[PDB]
Amino acid sequence: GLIKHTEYMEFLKSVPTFQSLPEEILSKLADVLEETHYENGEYIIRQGARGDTFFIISKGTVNVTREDSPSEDPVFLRTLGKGDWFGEKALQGEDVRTANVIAAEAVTCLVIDRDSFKHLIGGLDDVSNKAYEDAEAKAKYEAEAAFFANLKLSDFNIIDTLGVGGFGRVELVQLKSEESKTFAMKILKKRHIVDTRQQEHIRSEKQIMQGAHSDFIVRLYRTFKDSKYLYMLMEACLGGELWTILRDRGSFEDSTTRFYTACVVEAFAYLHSKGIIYRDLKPENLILDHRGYAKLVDFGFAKKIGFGKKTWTFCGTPEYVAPEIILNKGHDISADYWSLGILMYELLTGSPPFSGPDPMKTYNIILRGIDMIEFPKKIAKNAANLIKKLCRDNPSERLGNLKNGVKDIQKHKWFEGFNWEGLRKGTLTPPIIPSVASPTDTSNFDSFPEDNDEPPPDDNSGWDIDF
């Protein structure tokens, strides 16, 4: 019906999830959705029954209940109303109903069975599948956040240590209910953060790392907190630290360094797309997963900046600080292209190019520039040429900040023959293949002694409110 199709259309444009979708999808949905009516107390879905239908509530309210066992009272889960929906798993295949949906008053639902939804999905356009992916990604992450929001620290067990410092430590943890699932738990002493004045640094680290979805960045699922520590639940990358592998090997070959530099270029293309400066690039910030792919791990100095704006915080290890940071001229994402040049040089030779006996002396040699360095014979011509373009003194003139952004780095002669697409798909063979026997294998990390020392003092000031 023309009227009914427009009423369905105007109703679908009022639902927060469906309104982003194109007109083709919303119109084709309106062409096949059908109305079903219920009354107060009537069961729409019964737990344990089989089903092949998804419901969108267009009028009234429903009570969602469930029983954990046959000899137990039903536990009330939630109440849903106009614009909400339920029964979606019946579209994806699984028929058994895991909860009752009972009408709280007179209800109308717009329904679409499994076969109709499948037939609608089966024949669609190429543009029609692109905004569908954005909405599927958005709801796939909100569902991930909800899975982790249910968990507590008491649901995990410590396996072994991955790293130790003044900050605290990084532990390989296993989820008690699923032994195939292991994570890297970074446990920070709140006292060390307060003594170093990193309250806002750790606060933006949580915001950046959780919102980031890149295969070249370590995921941060959630955080926890208690009176002494902050806990950051991350993706376990069991291939090992790039700094220990670099230490063990001395330096990396040209092709080896190229694959790791390419991993950082992808991570930076993603961060720079969101207006985020990384600022902490060095071999210690890279970790290999079980395949040998490299990912950025630490977002302590990272910062969300506005398009066309600069920042002025003097931060970082002196050898990796860009000249505009030393000179207090303000900096943006182009300080990461400088860092990329420093990383290439250290990975190819075992040492970064600029280093004095203290910070001030290191800053003095940086201000002298990359054209004042005698490049080792070890560094290939194309690699030396790319380093000099990445480490141009003026950030405006720096490669990656020119006409085509990061594409100017990707198109450089050093990367000729490099399969960027194969790297993004995960089919490019990495240069060092780590040996990982299981999710609990920590043999690619150094051994750490257990911490026998006293716990740090309690910190009950509410700067950690969001953790």
Ligand X SMILES: Nc1cc(C(=O)O)ccc1CN1CCC[C@H](O[C@H](CO)c2cc(Cl)cc(Cl)c2)[C@@H]1c1ccccc1
Q: Which residue ranges make up the annotated binding site? A: 78, 87-90, 97-98, 132, 162-170, 186
Which range touches ligand X (CB under 6 A), out of 17-25, 70-78, 176-184, 301-309?
17-25
The smaller minimum CB distance to ligand X, of residues 29 and 335, is found at 29
Interface with ligand X (CB under 6 A), residue from 43, 132, 243, 448 = 132
Which range touches ligand X (CB under 6 A), out of 62-70, 128-136, 337-345, 457-465?
128-136
The footprint of ligand X on this chain (CB under 6 A) covers a number of residues equal to 15
Please report how close the Cβ of residue 112 comes to ligand X at its closest, in angstroms: 5
User: What residue number has its CB nearest to ligand X?
Assistant: 139
14: left (phi over 0), alpha (psi -120 to 50) or beta: alpha
Residue 153 binds ligand X (CB under 6 A) = no
Please report how close the Cβ of residue 290 comes to ligand X at its closest, in angstroms: 23
Residue 54 binds ligand X (CB under 6 A) = yes
Question: Inter-axis angle of helices 254-273 and 334-349, to 10 degrees?
Answer: 160
Interface with ligand X (CB under 6 A), residue from 49, 139, 367, 433 = 139
Residue 91 binds ligand X (CB under 6 A) = yes
State the binding site for 3',5'-cyclic GMP.
78, 87-90, 97-98, 132
Which range touches ligand X (CB under 6 A), out of 133-141, 384-392, 399-407, 425-433?
133-141
The smaller minimum CB distance to ligand X, of residues 55 and 259, is found at 55
How far is C-alpha 430 from the geometric centre of its chain's CA atoms?
21
Residue 73, φ and ψ in degrees, nearest 5: -60, 150
Q: Which distant-in-sequence residues (6+ apart) come within 8 Å of 223 by Cβ?
A: 206, 210, 230, 231, 232, 233, 467
Which range touches ligand X (CB under 6 A), out of 139-147, 282-290, 305-313, 374-382?
139-147
Q: Find the catalytic residue in 160, 226, 280, 408.
A: 280
Interface with ligand X (CB under 6 A), residue from 50, 140, 213, 368 = 140
Q: Is 174 exposed, middle or buried (0-12, 13-18, 19+ CB in 10 A)?
A: buried
Which range touches ligand X (CB under 6 A), out of 69-77, 136-144, 351-359, 406-414?
136-144
Interface with ligand X (CB under 6 A), residue from 32, 64, 124, 135 = 135
Interface with ligand X (CB under 6 A), residue from 34, 35, 88, 397 = 88
The smaller minimum CB distance to ligand X, of residues 17 and 440, is found at 17
Residue 115 binds ligand X (CB under 6 A) = no
Residue 136 binds ligand X (CB under 6 A) = yes
Please report how close the Cβ of residue 447 comes to ligand X at its closest, in angstroms: 39
Please report how close the Cβ of residue 62 comes to ligand X at its closest, in angstroms: 16
Please report how close the Cβ of residue 134 comes to ligand X at its closest, in angstroms: 8
Residues 398 and 338: beta-carbon distance below 8 Å? yes
Residue 173 binds ligand X (CB under 6 A) = no
Q: How far apart are CA 381 and CA 271, in angstroms?
A: 29
- ∠ Cα 266 401 417 (to 5°): 45
Question: Inter-axis angle of helices 381-390 and 334-349, to 10 degrees?
Answer: 150
Residue 112 binds ligand X (CB under 6 A) = yes
Please report how close the Cβ of residue 9 comes to ligand X at its closest, in angstroms: 13
Interface with ligand X (CB under 6 A), residue from 9, 17, 224, 349 = 17
Catalytic residue flag (residue 280) = yes
Please report how close the Cβ of residue 99 comes to ligand X at its closest, in angstroms: 15
Residue 379 binds ligand X (CB under 6 A) = no
The smaller minimum CB distance to ligand X, of residues 113 and 253, is found at 113
The smaller minimum CB distance to ligand X, of residues 76 and 141, is found at 141
Residues that bind ligand X in the complex, under the rule CB under 6 A? 17, 21, 25, 29, 54, 85, 88, 91, 112, 132, 135-136, 139-140, 143
> Which residues are known to be catalytic?
280
